[PDB]
Design a protein around this nucleic acid. Structure first.
Lengths: 176, 77, 63, 92
RNA sequence: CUUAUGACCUGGGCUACACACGUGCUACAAUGGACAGAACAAAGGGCAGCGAAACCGCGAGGUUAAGCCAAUCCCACAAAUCUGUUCUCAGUUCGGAUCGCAGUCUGCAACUCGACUGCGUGAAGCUGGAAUCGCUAGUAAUCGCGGAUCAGCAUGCCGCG
């Protein structure tokens, strides 16, 4: 645990009293966290698809999916059905553990981390990133690390407005 | 100059003192590109003779660490 | 959770050089770290070193 | 790592520390003298005591994290203030 | 030509480069790189000049100042080299150019405009096309030393070992 109790006992009641909601479960909740890899560099390195798949299994036990091109493109030398990037959906204790690991190690481990992007709120109430380093936190085995491209992370919340999502993230510990 | 003190022309320093004793005013023309910029130069839109014309330049705070020639180019292209 | 397709999740005690201990379900049984959240200066509020060196220039008119 | 950047494991500490920007020959040797490691040791073969010693020494001293920003600030200042020197900088 | 093709002064240019080519210096490394110890020099200069020694500073150098109009004293403890420690075949503990900062010599002032020192990095570059250059003995190659021009400026010049 270490996050579920903290949330239920500090974020939900405080945020509910702050926003004057008419019900208990009207408080916005973090539904899921989706991690994507984006790469079609697989065109020039067929084995690159294997990369970030063995790394994602260590980042989170949930094995990623080998997403395939939904449309072909000549500018990128693409054909429909070819593998491009990877997808992972964390729902349950997995997303809580991922948030804990992130907040505790990844952000403080970055060398020049100061005032993370405030922009990358969706308008809608979601929050979106593309980590550019592939070795952000310890489970990536610096020694075994050969390529340096990091991960897309997409935080999804039931927030109806960006303001309440910002408040929820700040109270959770997002160092804006 | 390392410990002998900063560098400035006597006539230019006297002009700047006369102009600052009451209030900063019209450009202070001078041919002394050698002079180093001091905090007193702040606010005074000094002019530098680049060889054929005077270029008025507004000396801000951060200009103290440079010379007028650094703001008065000479070569043309 | 599929059978065998995922590695075994294990509760580990994330350690820090400053002594802070954090617990998270991780593949590794233990995780040694050097800079935790509180160890990183940004989480320490106004860091002393940064707040002290962040002053603007004064033209170095000391001499 | 000590300064957030990995260092060669099969090299002496003296030169392993030089791979950190801002920490060159003299700085690395001074840090090693302050730590009392004799300057002839492998970095892959060390203990928590002398590791944390160098860690705190670096945290107290300047680091690439600060130098990268200070140099950029100075460059942008000398470029914005005019500074034919800065003009040459912008010209490359 | 001449109240200007002459003369005075501030500043600039003589030092700009998408360029090409002569001459020279430095590099691409294991006959090597860095650190500890040790020896030998030959010629030339010194009066607003040369400046022992001491102190300060990693440093370039600064302060007090002996001595010398010189076979006296100084410039001025030559380096290559040798005996050790250490690294290991890599764009590297190679090279230090370009580079940011902080300083030193001088001079009213090194900003267009010197050199040198420390800090942190470090590329071009891993031997280089036709073709071409010098060298028959203390020659080739190569390591240092001193003077001219000089307030302060040499990879060039003159010579020496």
């Amino acid at each position: 645990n270490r996050l579920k109790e903290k949330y239920n006992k500090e974020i939900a009641p405080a945020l509910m009293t702050k926003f004057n909601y008419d019900s208990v479960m009207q408080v916005p909740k973090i539904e899921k966290i989706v991690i994507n890899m984006g790469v079609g560099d697989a065109v020039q390195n067929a084995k690159a698809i294997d990369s970030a798949v063995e790394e994602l299994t260590f980042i989170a036990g949930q094995k990623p999916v080998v997403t395939r091109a939904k449309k072909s493109i000549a500018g990128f030398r693409l054909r429909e059905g070819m593998p491009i990037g990877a997808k992972v959906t964390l729902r349950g204790e997995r997303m809580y553990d991922f948030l804990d690991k992130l907040i505790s190690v990844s952000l403080p481990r970055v060398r020049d981390f100061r005032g993370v992007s405030k922009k990358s709120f969706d308008g809608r109430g979601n929050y979106t990133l593309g980590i550019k380093e592939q070795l952000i936190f310890p489970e990536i085995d610096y020694d075994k690390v050969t390529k340096v491209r990091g991960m897309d992370i997409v935080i999804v919340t039931t927030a109806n407005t960006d303001e309440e999502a910002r408040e929820l993230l700040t109270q959770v510990g997002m160092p804006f | 100059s390392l410990k002998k003190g900063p560098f400035v022309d006597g006539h230019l320093m006297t002009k700047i003192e006369k102009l600052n004793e009451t209030d900063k005013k019209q450009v202070v023309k001078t041919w002394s590109r050698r002079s180093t910029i001091f905090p007193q130069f702040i606010g005074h839109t000094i002019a530098v003779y680049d060889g054929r014309k005077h270029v008025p330049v507004f000396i801000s705070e951060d200009m103290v660490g440079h010379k007028l020639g650094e703001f008065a180019p000479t070569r043309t292209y | 959770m599929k059978a065998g397709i995922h590695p075994n999740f294990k509760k580990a005690t994330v350690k820090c050089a400053c002594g802070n201990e954090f617990e998270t379900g991780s593949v590794k049984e233990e995780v040694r770290v050097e800079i935790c959240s509180e160890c990183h200066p940004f989480y320490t509020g106004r860091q002393k070193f940064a707040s002290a060196d962040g002053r603007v220039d004064r033209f170095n008119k000391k001499y | 790592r000590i300064a957030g950047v990995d260092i060669p494991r099969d090299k002496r500490v003296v030169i392993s520390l030089t791979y950190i920007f801002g920490i060159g020959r003299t700085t690395a040797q001074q840090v090693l003298k302050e730590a009392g490691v004799s300057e002839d040791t492998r970095v892959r073969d060390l203990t928590e005591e002398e590791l944390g010693k160098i860690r705190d020494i670096i945290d107290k001293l300047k680091v690439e994290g600060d130098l990268r920003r200070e140099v950029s600030l100075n460059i942008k200042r000398l470029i914005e203030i005019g500074s034919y020197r800065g003009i040459r900088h912008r010209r490359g």
